[PDB]
């Protein structure tokens, strides 16, 4: 019980060091093509599994189209964790990024 | 009767995204009650104080919104959750 | 792949090493001594290469 | 909930009428094949597409 707590504290502290604070991220403010593609794919996969939908489906049956509709209106509840080669990372919500 | 604080790595479906705590309860914790558990040591009778460990470390512990890591292949999320189990171990 | 069957674990790294003689003697379910694979009537002979402790073989339940 | 309009018709159309359906995967993983089935059985199966699961273990899952 005590070894696991030490392991958990060590892992959480090592992760906390990796996380770049919100006011120090120096990556591009735009959303890359790969980031947009995977956002759409993951959101569509979620919607396909009865995830709550934050947009009006104008008679649409394609989950990917629902994801694109939500991305147009910036209502996707996802976060991109951009990884630097060192292992340190930055967190950007989809709202903060600007498409194209 | 003993209270044991545990941390479990559990999954979360898309249907429980707006209520992740109730999703963890209805998925992994409710089936765990009234059944002897070998990794605890007795008959789990209840759980209390369920909390989700946030994926971003810089958030507070009082933040209402947290981050859950989505599986690369599936839409399921996975996260660590701490909870105190009330268990009768004979 | 089935998106409704999530996997909770993940392989992060692998490392290479020699398989010591002590461990294989422990993990093994049976050792082979007779260099005849299957006897008459097509049945796999116990202790041979095709042993029911090495896995199910041709509609025979694995002994392990 | 948004899909049953098309998926029901796909199940009815069967495996040999495009657009159609060739298999149904229940929540538990059962793979009901639509190949050797009549139209009436296909309508019975299609009317039971969006039926909520009776099992707690798969209550987060839907058919495919």
């Amino acid at each position: 019980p005590e070894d696991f707590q030490q392991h958990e504290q060590i892992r959480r502290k090592t992760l906390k060091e990796k996380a770049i604070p919100k006011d120090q991220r120096a990556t591009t403010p735009y959303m890359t093509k790969y980031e947009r593609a995977r956002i759409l794919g993951t959101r569509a996969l979620q919607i396909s599994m009865n995830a709550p939908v934050f947009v009006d489906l104008e008679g649409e049956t394609d989950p990917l189209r629902i994801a694109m509709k939500e991305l147009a209106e910036k209502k996707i509840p996802l976060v991109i964790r951009r990884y630097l080669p060192d292992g340190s990372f930055e967190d950007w919500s989809v709202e903060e990024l600007i498409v194209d | 009767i003993v209270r044991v604080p545990i941390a479990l790595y559990v999954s979360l479906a898309p249907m429980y995204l707006e209520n992740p705590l109730q999703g963890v309860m209805k998925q992994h914790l409710n089936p765990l009650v009234m059944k002897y558990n070998n990794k605890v040591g007795g008959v789990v009778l209840g759980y209390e104080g369920l909390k989700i460990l946030d994926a971003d470390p810089l958030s507070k512990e009082d933040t209402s919104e947290k981050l859950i890591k989505i599986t690369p292949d599936t839409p399921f999320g996975f996260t660590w959750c701490h909870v105190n189990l009330y268990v009768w171990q004979p | 792949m089935d998106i409704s069957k999530p996997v909770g674990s993940e392989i992060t790294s692998v490392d290479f090493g020699i398989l010591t003689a002590k461990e294989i003697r422990n993990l093994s379910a049976k050792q082979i001594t007779n260099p005849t694979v299957l006897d008459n009537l097509g049945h796999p002979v116990s202790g041979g290469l095709y042993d029911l402790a090495l896995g199910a073989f041709l509609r025979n339940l694995c002994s392990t | 909930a948004y899909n049953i309009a098309e998926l029901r018709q796909a199940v009815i159309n069967g495996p040999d009428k495009w657009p159609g359906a060739t298999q149904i995967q229940n929540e538990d993983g059962s793979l009901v094949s639509l190949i050797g089935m009549s139209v009436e059985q296909r309508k019975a199966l299609a009317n039971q597409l969006l039926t909520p699961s009776s099992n707690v273990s798969t209550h987060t899952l839907n058919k495919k």
């Binding site: 707590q5 | 003993v2 559990v10 | - | -």
Partner: peptide, 18 residues
């Protein structure tokens, strides 16, 4: 039964029983 949608992937004890 015994699925990642039912049982925890890993369960560890944090503190000693109390």
């Amino acid at each position: 039964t015994a699925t990642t949608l039912n049982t925890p992937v890993v369960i560890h004890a944090t503190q000693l029983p109390q």
